[PDB]
Design an enzyme around this catalytic site. Sequence first.
Site, PDB file in Angstrom:
ATOM      1  N   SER A  97       0.547  -1.074  -0.169  1.00 41.97           N
ATOM      2  CA  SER A  97      -0.013  -0.310  -0.057  1.00 41.97           C
ATOM      3  C   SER A  97       1.001   1.186   0.362  1.00 41.97           C
ATOM      4  O   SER A  97       0.356   2.753  -0.447  1.00 41.97           O
ATOM      5  CB  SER A  97      -0.729   0.057   1.138  1.00 41.97           C
ATOM      6  N   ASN A 126      -7.910  -0.783  -3.509  1.00 46.70           N
ATOM      7  CA  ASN A 126      -6.738  -0.569  -4.630  1.00 46.70           C
ATOM      8  C   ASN A 126      -7.564  -0.803  -5.988  1.00 46.70           C
ATOM      9  O   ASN A 126      -6.941  -0.419  -6.355  1.00 46.70           O
ATOM     10  CB  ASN A 126      -5.933  -2.076  -4.378  1.00 46.70           C
ATOM     11  N   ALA A 159       1.297  -3.209   3.422  1.00 44.85           N
ATOM     12  CA  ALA A 159       1.605  -4.948   3.074  1.00 44.85           C
ATOM     13  C   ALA A 159       0.723  -5.051   2.244  1.00 44.85           C
ATOM     14  O   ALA A 159      -0.066  -4.952   1.238  1.00 44.85           O
ATOM     15  CB  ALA A 159       0.102  -5.068   4.516  1.00 44.85           C
ATOM     16  N   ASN A 210       4.562  -9.409   7.449  1.00 44.75           N
ATOM     17  CA  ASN A 210       3.341  -8.652   7.608  1.00 44.75           C
ATOM     18  C   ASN A 210       2.958  -9.222   9.386  1.00 44.75           C
ATOM     19  O   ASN A 210       2.319  -9.606   9.101  1.00 44.75           O
ATOM     20  CB  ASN A 210       2.116  -9.021   6.624  1.00 44.75           C
TER      21      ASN A 210
HETATM   22  C1  LIG Z   1      -6.097  -1.969   5.324  1.00 47.62           C
HETATM   23  C2  LIG Z   1      -6.490  -2.499   4.095  1.00 47.62           C
HETATM   24  C3  LIG Z   1      -6.449  -1.146   3.086  1.00 47.62           C
HETATM   25  S1  LIG Z   1      -5.944  -1.524   1.665  1.00 47.62           S
HETATM   26  C4  LIG Z   1      -4.374  -2.569   1.818  1.00 47.62           C
HETATM   27  C5  LIG Z   1      -3.709  -3.556   0.763  1.00 47.62           C
HETATM   28  C6  LIG Z   1      -2.196  -1.601   0.943  1.00 47.62           C
HETATM   29  O1  LIG Z   1      -1.926  -1.881   1.602  1.00 47.62           O
HETATM   30  N1  LIG Z   1      -3.725  -4.410   0.436  1.00 47.62           N
HETATM   31  C7  LIG Z   1      -3.446  -5.089  -0.005  1.00 47.62           C
HETATM   32  O2  LIG Z   1      -2.822  -4.831  -1.169  1.00 47.62           O
HETATM   33  C8  LIG Z   1      -3.121  -6.135   0.113  1.00 47.62           C
HETATM   34  C9  LIG Z   1      -2.390  -6.806   1.342  1.00 47.62           C
HETATM   35  C10 LIG Z   1      -3.193  -8.327   2.224  1.00 47.62           C
HETATM   36  C11 LIG Z   1      -1.565  -8.051   3.294  1.00 47.62           C
HETATM   37  C12 LIG Z   1      -2.252  -9.860   3.617  1.00 47.62           C
HETATM   38  N2  LIG Z   1      -4.261 -10.493   3.978  1.00 47.62           N
HETATM   39  N3  LIG Z   1      -2.623  -7.321  -1.017  1.00 47.62           N
HETATM   40  C13 LIG Z   1      -1.899  -7.798  -2.053  1.00 47.62           C
HETATM   41  O3  LIG Z   1      -0.714  -6.894  -1.725  1.00 47.62           O
HETATM   42  C14 LIG Z   1      -2.492  -8.524  -3.529  1.00 47.62           C
HETATM   43  C15 LIG Z   1      -2.961  -9.860  -3.257  1.00 47.62           C
HETATM   44  C16 LIG Z   1      -2.139 -11.013  -1.955  1.00 47.62           C
HETATM   45  N4  LIG Z   1      -2.610 -11.790  -2.467  1.00 47.62           N
HETATM   46  C17 LIG Z   1      -2.716 -12.954  -1.280  1.00 47.62           C
HETATM   47  O4  LIG Z   1      -3.745 -14.047  -1.464  1.00 47.62           O
HETATM   48  C18 LIG Z   1      -2.191 -12.736   0.308  1.00 47.62           C
HETATM   49  C19 LIG Z   1      -2.387 -12.125   0.866  1.00 47.62           C
HETATM   50  N5  LIG Z   1      -1.250 -13.347  -0.533  1.00 47.62           N
HETATM   51  C20 LIG Z   1      -0.396 -14.502   0.383  1.00 47.62           C
HETATM   52  C21 LIG Z   1       0.950 -14.706   0.005  1.00 47.62           C
HETATM   53  O5  LIG Z   1      -1.385 -15.181   0.823  1.00 47.62           O
HETATM   54  C22 LIG Z   1      -0.539 -10.958  -2.994  1.00 47.62           C
HETATM   55  O6  LIG Z   1       0.198 -10.490  -1.788  1.00 47.62           O
HETATM   56  O7  LIG Z   1      -0.787 -11.519  -4.044  1.00 47.62           O
HETATM   57  N6  LIG Z   1      -4.904  -3.728   3.175  1.00 47.62           N
HETATM   58  C23 LIG Z   1      -6.073  -3.795   3.509  1.00 47.62           C
HETATM   59  C24 LIG Z   1      -6.074  -5.412   4.328  1.00 47.62           C
HETATM   60  O8  LIG Z   1      -7.702  -4.650   4.993  1.00 47.62           O
HETATM   61  O9  LIG Z   1      -5.443  -6.425   4.336  1.00 47.62           O
END
Ligand SMILES: C=C1CS[C@H]([C@@H](C=O)NC(=O)[C@H](CCCCN)NC(=O)CC[C@@H](NC(=O)[C@H](C)NC(C)=O)C(=O)O)N=C1C(=O)O
Length: 355
Positions: A61, A149, A312, A337
Amino acid sequence: APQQINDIVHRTITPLIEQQKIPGMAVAVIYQGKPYYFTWGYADIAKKQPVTQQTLFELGSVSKTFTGVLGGDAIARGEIKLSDPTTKYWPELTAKQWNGITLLHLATYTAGGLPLLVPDEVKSSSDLLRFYQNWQPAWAPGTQRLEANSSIGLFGALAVKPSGLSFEQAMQTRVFQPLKLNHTWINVPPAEEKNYAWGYREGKAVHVSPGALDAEAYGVKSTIEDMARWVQSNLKPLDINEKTLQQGIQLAQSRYWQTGDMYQGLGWEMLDWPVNPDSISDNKIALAARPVKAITPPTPAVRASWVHKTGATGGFGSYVAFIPEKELGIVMLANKNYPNPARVDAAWQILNALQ
Ligand SMILES: C=C1CS[C@H]([C@@H](C=O)NC(=O)[C@H](CCCCN)NC(=O)CC[C@@H](NC(=O)[C@H](C)NC(C)=O)C(=O)O)N=C1C(=O)O
Ligand SMILES: [K+]
């Protein structure tokens, strides 16, 4: 480093790594404008590669700060306006819910409940148009903020349309190359793979998976040296020689919306400094819908601010904070993370001790 900096960082981060079982970490502190670097652990546990100042970490993010500044640069160039309707840049977006959704709304997560992620079964440019056409907003535009996103990612894709450049090309030529971020990447080249840390999620080495609008929202990988330079550029935008970029950094720190004590920028989020540390997440909150109050017109970048962003991916946890009025800042990059409150706690403990 000076021993004061040495001692606050090592007494804060050493027990953070312990408690959170972080495999590898890099920290930069910027103290009177000047960076100081710190590394621990491993970038690759199996191959026994240490974290160095050249280790690439997934920003997650925190990538949104780059997209917000690139969008700011496009506004300053006269290519886009935040007041423009979304449909000005995507005319095939004809579904009636899009009437009154502007680029401001997309950039600040206020469009009316666009989701955190674009669904995984969206690949192609036709799949992405169907997703946005069929999306039914819960709320009217400019009323509620839901970090997304799919929101800021669409902002980034549209913001570069009038330039004729791909998102990556615009990012490279307009942001990375002028700021000398020569080890920052949307796609990690083969030559740099030896430096690309593995992320770790339940003991398993992992990198971020491809998805739709992933460059625009969560796709940047960088070193702790380039992220320190990114903080210096955001602390002191008037030192930047490229006029529209200087102005684009300033626009990304303008205060567009208020929820509670926080102010939404373009990618960046802001609080008034001095800041209560409990007032500064993912304390495991998957979705946090908040009402917003428009700041009419947006307040230009306030130098007495705590400016920060968390980030993350599945395998990485990032955090950037800075205080323009003190010339202070911090970047924390980890290949696990770990909870957002532990990040903010450690950052506050370090920067508070240095002002
Ligand atoms: C608070 C927010 C706002 S948006 C924010 C945003 C920015 O950091 N998150 C993402 O982009 C999320 C991260 C989630 C962290 C673990 N659950 N997604 C990603 O980065 C891309 C998808 C991700 N896909 C997956 O299936 C998981 C999380 N990865 C694995 C290895 O299991 C990947 O790493 O490939 N995420 C959240 C949330 O609720 O997790
Ligand atoms: K993509």
